[PDB]
Design a protein around this ligand. Structure first.
Ligand SMILES: CO[C@H]1C[C@@H]2CC[C@@H](C)[C@@](O)(O2)C(=O)C(=O)N2CCCC[C@H]2C(=O)O[C@H]([C@H](C)C[C@@H]2CC[C@@H](O)[C@H](OC)C2)C[C@@H](OC)[C@H](C)/C=C(\C)[C@@H](O)[C@@H](OC)C(=O)[C@H](C)C[C@H](C)/C=C/C=C/C=C/1C
Lengths: 95, 108
């Protein structure tokens, strides 16, 4: 039960992030789990299973980061919810 | 405290959402005064969630459970059952009475 593959990592990663932000109001803590996962996408896929994940969900996840960057500049929490609407879409399809 | 439910349109009666099943709904959340903060009807896509696993707030956890399939209703949720003293920053302030219109379309 250790997350090697990207869909496994993104599943428990978003579950941890969502618990921190919505459950406990921890915005900084929510980014600390998100930002490393997004950074591994930006490095790029190695395996076939990583590439097929990036084809399916990579555009949605990169858009969710762009909304997260818009929250950092603006400060309006409405931008942060738009990211979490995209994060929920990718979570259910993995689930 | 609590969650006062008031029906808009009636359900089938017999079919209820058990533990394990994924409640597919349409909803509209609005504040105590009237102003609207979130709505799935405006997005034109329904919202799915697994009941019984503490996924949603306490008003939904008891309020949606008592509803039958194909039933529209107005759930006036108290701040005890809602987000409460902390609230949800920049959307729901401290000690808010949340009015939730909701329609349980499909049990799934
Ligand atoms: C941008 O979209 C937001 C929702 C916005 C966020 C802002 C809100 C004002 C509101 O606009 O919805 C709103 O209208 C509202 O008030 N809603 C929504 C509909 C039902 C009632 C109520 C409403 O209960 O929502 C809930 C509260 C926020 C947190 C809950 C309250 C109960 C409490 O025990 C719980 O503690 C952990 C936090 C948000 C839920 O979303 C349904 C989502 C799906 C659930 C969670 C964050 C957690 O459970 C989580 O755990 C680890 C999970 O298991 C899920 C399955 C993991 C997954 C990765 C999370 C994805 C995030 C999705 C975010 C979405 C869809």
């Amino acid at each position: 039960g250790v997350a090697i593959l990207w869909h496994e990592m993104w599943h428990e990663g978003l579950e941890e992030a969502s618990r921190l932000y919505f459950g406990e109001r921890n915005v900084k803590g929510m980014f600390e789990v998100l930002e490393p996962l997004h950074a591994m996408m930006e490095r790029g896929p190695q395996t076939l299973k990583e590439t097929s994940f990036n084809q399916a969900y990579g555009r949605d996840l990169m858009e969710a980061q762009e909304w997260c960057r818009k929250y950092m500049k603006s400060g309006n929490v409405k931008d942060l919810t738009q990211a979490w609407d995209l994060y929920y879409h990718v979570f259910r399809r993995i689930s | 405290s609590g969650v006062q439910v008031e029906t808009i349109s009636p359900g089938d009666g017999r079919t209820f959402p058990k533990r394990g099943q994924t409640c597919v709904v349409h909803y509209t959340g609005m504040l105590e005064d009237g102003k609207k903060f979130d709505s799935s009807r405006d997005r034109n896509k329904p919202f799915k969630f697994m009941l019984g696993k503490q996924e949603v707030i306490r008003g939904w956890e008891e309020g949606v459970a008592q509803m039958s399939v194909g039933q529209r209703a107005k759930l006036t949720i108290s701040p005890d059952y809602a987000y409460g003293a902390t609230g949800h920053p920049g959307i729901i302030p401290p000690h808010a009475t949340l009015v939730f219109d909701v329609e349980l379309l499909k049990l799934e």
